[PDB]
Nucleic acid binder design. Structure first.
Ligand SMILES: Nc1ncnc2c1ncn2[C@@H]1O[C@H](COP(=O)(O)OP(=O)(O)O)[C@@H](O)[C@H]1O
Ligand SMILES: [Mg+2]
Ligand SMILES: [Mg+2]
Lengths: 312, 50, 312, 312, 312, 313, 309, 48
DNA sequence: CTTCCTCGAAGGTTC
DNA sequence: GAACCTTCGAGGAAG
């Protein structure tokens, strides 16, 4: 299937994957529940996929929900106490839970009980509701939004990193086997180098090249077809989009490389300041084409040799 | 028919249907016009003070 | 009617049309729904119009709603429950939705299911709604306000561009036919050069000139009639308005072309600092009348010859 | 009635009248509704009265409301259901309509349809409504405070200017003719100059002068009687109000002539910022009593000699 | 007298009192009702007493209500229907009635009738009610907080102002007669100077001085006794309250005259920051003891000599 | 004494105490009740006890209630009928009374009657209920939210103030006797100086010092025990806790006196924004050690000299 | 068990622990209940644990509830109605109670009676002598009237290296794992001063020794396990080290803004400001300045670069 | 005497008491001959 | 009641 | 000393 199911199939993330293997194997030897795990990092790196792999390796059934669907203490109190011994509870977007609900987890995670008011009027009473052993798993992109007392209770932490070209090539070839398409190893590398390091983008490029090859070609992804399709999409061999190329060119041909301010540059390309700072500048900086300084943006030597100008 | 139009106007002024019905039903004058009914149902409900 | 119904009618946007044709034809051969698509760019360029064409080409019923019309998760779930296999859902001004709603689409777009809490509260449980195949289409004026995880899920992106005079001239002609008027080709080009490259503006100017020619003339838009109407509407032959002209005049009469600071210039024209910077300065720069420099903005020779002064 | 009802009665605003006449006449050879029109300018210049003239020239019914009177987006939909074909809707103070409500008009103006949510809870469903042909007339003081999506959809723009001495004098003679009053040509000229170039003020003054001349005189308004009556009221020799005197006095005595910002002045004079910015500054500037600078406003020498201070 | 029936009995407000006399008698000569009048100014100056005098001079019964006492159109229509030709309706705090009432108030004031549309969908009717002639008199604290379109419906404005020392001393003398207390012209003038312009403040001090003279003195309010009593009450010779003195003393002794922010100052003295800016600073600024600046409040040189401190 | 009966026994508040003495005596010389009184000041200074002493001087009974506890007009009228001639009614937190009740109090205060109106149209009638002369005593803490119609009826205004070393010290001595603890006069002064002018704080300090003196000492509070007891606790001779000293030290050592933002200061001392801004910062301003500015907090010259640092502009 | 039960077992907190002994011993001598106590401070320092110890030293039965569990005054009345003479009521996360409930509680604390309205009817109670114990992280969120009723205030602090070393040795014996003295100090230096973090590292190291070792912790396995977690000898994580490296090599030590730094490491702005910087500022590796943040001389020494003023 | 019995309840209703409760409150008073003022006074006093 | 966001100040560089 | 650019801090209003 499109999502891997076992560590055999999960490519990359060697640091995270190695740690989880050791902790999961030790937990089985003691015959006890796995500690609480928190998975966090950039978008599209495999956080949701890993949570399903953990449940398969432990050999237990997974219960799933999300932070937005939970809104009041009665909701979580009803989800809890439905757990059987050894269940795994996975909450996606755990950062959306209201802070009044987060504080109910403080007792549940540390001591496996929650205080509940039961009865009404004179019959109202406070009694311990005692939970069976279980493992909570959360996934989030905004870990800094969780309360400090909660993050302190997670016993395992996983920070997801970007993938390298060798691993991305193997993912493209794997996906090219679910779809019934022949792909040459040259084209598999030609795509991976443009995927910005993210598996979700690699899958998106493959689907777009497929549509072209089966309409404008013979339905085979060869080197000749791939170059034509990537020219239609106008994606450079470094993953720079059409607008990205225009930004670097405007900086070198009008300001001689800078320094130039964000406002002045945006107006010259007819783009609003927000789209430039949020969609395009972040990748150019991480790859070293632009440098931010107190006086403005500056084009680096690497940008000159990429666009073909002279670094005078 | 003037009863319905009278209540509708009182309803248009924001009075509840139960009170509007009682207010108009308390008044009775076959020769009254829809305007003259409204001017009497309200005059009977305001607490006049001197 | 004014809005084109098919790609054969739609003029311009060659880059967007070429890509959409290939993807729509490939989807039909496989007998599948189209991938999610995001349309973005400046106002009045044709974003809404294109969405209807896509529905006509796929041959399916287009369901419509808007960002500010959706206020809570229950509203979206109601809209999504009404979907049928292959329907197209169009959400205009998608950047206006609240974040607590946008995070519900994350599962709907990737796995076609939604987590919901149901029941009065005494008894309740989480359940999965399973959605049929569907295609989401979004339109926005500012893609920078969308979260990174949402943009990553759109499989097709269409950036709209301004129109060139040849393409904008043909649009003026077509619109004259629907009004049953006759227009000389010289007049159609005059209107285009004053429309700032936007089809919406071109239609408005034509509608006003049409009224004038049929009231004080022989019902024909000739080059001489157009000049009279456009002089009464106070639109220069460069598409500048009176406020724009007042700015250029002040920069030459009081500062000899600058450099001058924005605050200093604003005072001499009784214009608000940000109004000038956000409303008028952008077009003057893109046309090349004004130029920004480290010590202030400067009027180019093109601005001198247009005003009739002597350059130095 | 005091309010004019036809263009043959409406004095002044020739630049506006000429345009509206041509557009209205064209809209009658075709059986069509007039395009949405936006009227903007200082308060009290006669834009509300103009709406009645348009409605009478079209020969259609007129319905009135105001931005603040529409409490919520649903109230607008209910109002639109009462509009008959060809009805004109006038919305005063259109710039202060709520954002959630303003975004409701966009689709109604452009395509005569609007998407709304009907029912509640499990019955909640989306619906679209289709509106009969109608013409919206909007009035606002701050022509630039409108949102670009709304502003770009109006087809006709009307900029209303102040009246000149020959025009206001004729209006005074007209008003004194509906009343059974007699006024000498010299007093009418004096009253106009004393009325800030604004018809509403000129009418209000005449009503009060009439009472004075009837009791303290022979029932006839003469220069000798008008000057006295104007001094019994608070109208100064230059038409300054009693509140204007406070502003000019404070700037010279408490700030040493300026420069001073209206923000800091407002709280020192104990007045609403909105009133000093809108009611007092526009006249004091356009008549040379106040000068605007990058640092702030400054009182001119004319203000020094008028108030009787030393022009240090 | 203390509670007058006619203008000849009312003390002070000579400017407003002189204006109303001409308008009231002129209306009788024409045999018609008086135009709508708006009274505004500081609280406690006599606005309510003035409305009764107007009704007596006209020879009309006065009806009274208040802004908060009206909640729905049915309330106003009920009162207005019970009016008799020429009756006066007084509404206190006309600026605070609900906005849904003002829509009805317009037609009542301008047309003297109301139109109540009824029916929906395929049905549309209205009932039209006619009302007798009447005069509306409204009172407010500020003229700018009133609704802009409503403010245009009033034809007469009355600006009340603080009382002078000769008028205050007259009031003090009259009040002493009610309590059977003998007060000399010297003491009467002292209580006036220190009452800062408001009659009910002068009445409070008189009552307190009686209790002192009856025990600490010989029952006669001499100048020597009056001056002693006021120091026991801690009232400065400039009329600074106990709290007013605390503010100035703190700025000089703890902050070297400032500048100091409102948040800092209001926390040093046990007071609410919203209270200091509303009840105490206004009088201190009008008397020139405090002056506002970008850095905060500053104590002027006058305050230094008043409090008895060596100025810089 | 702790349960005072007359102004002679009430500790402190000499300014308000001397003013009330005259108004009370002048009222007794006539067949009239005391004018309506309104007491202002920070919370926790003894306003409740002051009302009781006023009633004893007048020689009348005192009824007590509060604004939050009243909810309908009938509640107020029911209490007003229980009043005997000259009785005093004390309403605490009077600024929270619901408007529905406030509109009925105006007529009672001014004329001593209420005029209940009933019926409609031709059935419109009223009933007049006479009320016995009474004095209303109101107590508030947010004077700026009383309506002008209500404030106009209150004739006497009284301002409460923090106690001072010559009169705060006497409270400590009298409290020491309630639990039979002998305290030296020179030691009571050292406790009073650290009580921030609040009796609740002085009582709390004495309780803790007592526990120390009977476990680590001979059951006597001498100057030596006070020195040790006030050293185990962090309280400085100016009344600054351990955290207060750390805030001033951090601003002077690391930021040169500021300006420094609340967020940047919070992370240095490891405290929440709400804890520094509401627990510690308020007393430092009242003492004059810091000021708040548009760019952040700044330490004054008074703080430098108190903490022992050379101040340079 | 993991939670100590008596002061003889409670390692550290000498200031708070010393004071409570004096106050607890004096109360017993007078046969009176202990004064109301408030415990507050950073997360994981031992606040909850101390509440159970106080109850055992007093020899009383502890009643327990939490702030989030109490929604209306009717709930609190039912709880208080169960108190017996000398009983202790412990309310955790006390800052969450609604303001309508706090107004009731501070009256009961001073006068030991309740007179409240709760179809509405008055309820009256006369409570026996009792002690309320509160624990909270957001002490400043409580109203000033409530804080004035508490008679004892315990403010917690971070632990020293010798104390944490003894805590690691105690936990190791509960797991029946053998650990050498020189290896326990290695876990202490990395625990940021917090007992909960120390216990977490021991559990993670234990799992490694059972799979890659012989079930024994020694000064060789610890180095290997700590290299797998990538925790520096100062307690810096991988991302903490990346922040210092970027500032020193790309900005010459600063000043640099929060926005510029976040985009360079591909982190979210709020994650750096709330999760990583707080520890670096307290250790003295970074300082905030009016124009940005700069790396101090201590950072250069730790990363191994030439410092230049 | 029925007029006062009704009056006492009606005035008590304007004071915020419920129609049922006002009827009961007045019903608890025995003397019918006394005026509505005497009834409302006793009715209020009994509810304290 | 809480989070977000926008308005304002000022340090530093360069002409 | 006028003009740009980047950075931090305190309010407040929109759910
Ligand atoms: N000109 C005046 N002559 C006599 N008494 C006055 C005068 N102005 C105010 N007062 C007295 O001061 C108080 C003013 O009350 P009121 O007129 O209701 O104030 P306002 O209506 O201005 O708030 C009354 O006690 C009134 O008798
Ligand atoms: Mg996911
Ligand atoms: Mg805890």
């Amino acid at each position: 299937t499109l999502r891997p199911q076992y560590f055999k199939e999960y490519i990359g993330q060697d640091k995270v994957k190695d740690q989880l293997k050791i902790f999961i194997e030790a937990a089985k030897l003691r015959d006890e529940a796995l500690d609480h795990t928190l998975l966090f990092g950039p978008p599209g790196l495999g956080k949701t996929t890993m949570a399903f792999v953990i449940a398969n390796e432990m050999g237990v059934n997974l219960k799933q929900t999300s932070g937005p669907a939970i809104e009041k203490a009665g909701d979580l109190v009803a989800i809890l106490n439905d757990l059987e011994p050894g269940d795994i509870l996975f909450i996606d977007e755990i950062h959306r839970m209201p802070m009044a609900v987060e504080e109910v987890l403080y007792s549940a995670m540390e001591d496996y009980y929650i205080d509940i008011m039961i009865g009404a009027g004179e019959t109202s009473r406070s009694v311990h509701l005692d939970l069976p052993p279980f493992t909570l798993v959360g996934a989030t992109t905004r870990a800094g939004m969780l309360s400090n007392p909660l993050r302190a209770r997670f016993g395992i932490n996983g920070h997801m990193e970007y993938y390298e070209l060798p691993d991305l090539t193997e993912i493209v070839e794997r996906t090219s086997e679910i779809f019934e398409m022949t792909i040459t190893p040259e084209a598999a590398l030609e795509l991976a180098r443009r995927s910005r390091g993210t598996p979700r983008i690699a899958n998106r490029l493959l689907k777009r090249v497929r549509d072209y090859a089966q309409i404008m070609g013979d339905g085979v992804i060869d080197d000749k077809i791939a170059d034509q399709a990537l020219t239609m999409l106008d994606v450079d061999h470094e993953g720079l989009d059409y607008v990205d190329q225009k930004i670097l060119r405007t900086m070198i041909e009008m300001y001689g490389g800078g320094p130039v301010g964000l406002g002045t540059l945006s107006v010259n390309i007819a783009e609003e300041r927000e789209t430039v700072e949020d969609m395009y500048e972040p990748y150019l900086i991480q790859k070293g084409f632009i440098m931010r300084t107190r006086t403005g943006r500056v084009a680096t030597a690497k940008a000159y040799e990429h666009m073909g100008y002279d670094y005078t | 028919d003037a009863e319905q139009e009278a209540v509708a106007a009182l309803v248009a002024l924001g009075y509840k249907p139960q009170e509007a019905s009682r207010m108009v039903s308390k008044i009775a004058r076959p020769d009254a016009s829809s305007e003259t009914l409204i001017r009497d149902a309200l005059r009977a409900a305001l607490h006049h003070h001197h």
